[PDB]
Amino acid sequence: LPKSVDWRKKGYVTPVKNQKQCGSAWAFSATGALEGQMFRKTGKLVSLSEQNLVDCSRPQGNQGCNGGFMARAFQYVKENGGLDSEESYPYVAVDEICKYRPENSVAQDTGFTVVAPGKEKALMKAVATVGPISVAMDAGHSSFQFYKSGIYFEPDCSSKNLDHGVLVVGYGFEGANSQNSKYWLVKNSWGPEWGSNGYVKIAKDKNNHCGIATAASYPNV
Ligand SMILES: [Cl-]
Ligand SMILES: [Cl-]
Secondary structure, rough: OOOOEEHHHHHOOOOOOOOOEOOOHHHHHHHHHHHHHHHHHHHHOOOOHHHHHHHHHHHHOOOOOOOOOOHHHHHHHHHHHOOEEOOOOOOOOOOOOOOOOOHHHOOOOEEEEEEEOHHHHHHHHHHHHOOEEEEEEOOOHHHOOOOOEEHHHHHHHHOOOEEEEEEEEEEEEEEOOOOEEEEEEOOOOOOOOOOEOOEEEOOOOOOHHHOOOOEEEEEEO
């Protein structure tokens, strides 16, 4: 596998978004992964609608602004036959009426693939060969709230009880040895003001820190 990967350098990632006061991180993680797969398939980077997901995927088991799961969103895109663009179905941060329009669809998936649970080596392989991957993590910590630089490592992090969906856009390492002080490059959905331009480096190969490889998945396009 590559020693480092950064899909943002290849045009697969949109600018950082902000979920505001709505528990829709799961939807932002989902669109970020679909945005990268659509980019890989067509060479066109188009911002997708997290609102489409919030308002229309309750049948798949999502709960709009009260939470959800990336696999359930990819399932919604599959069953639904499409997903509209951010431009056509804007984000308002509140649960609203489903207004999915097939004519404005700019993405589709035939389902999704799951990364073997708890396997950081497996997630590394998915990131290197597919593109950005949706992952769940335990972000309920003040240290995460106030993160700004460096490799994030929090003793209270759990690898099992997770509460936030994010996007792994690559991985790297500090220094010259590609074998130590490794980290996952993660895109958050709390605006570009949070963290480092909206991103955070999370400790990699430190026992599935914060559960990054516990429930990873990506849409099949
Ligand atoms: Cl959330
Ligand atoms: Cl999921």
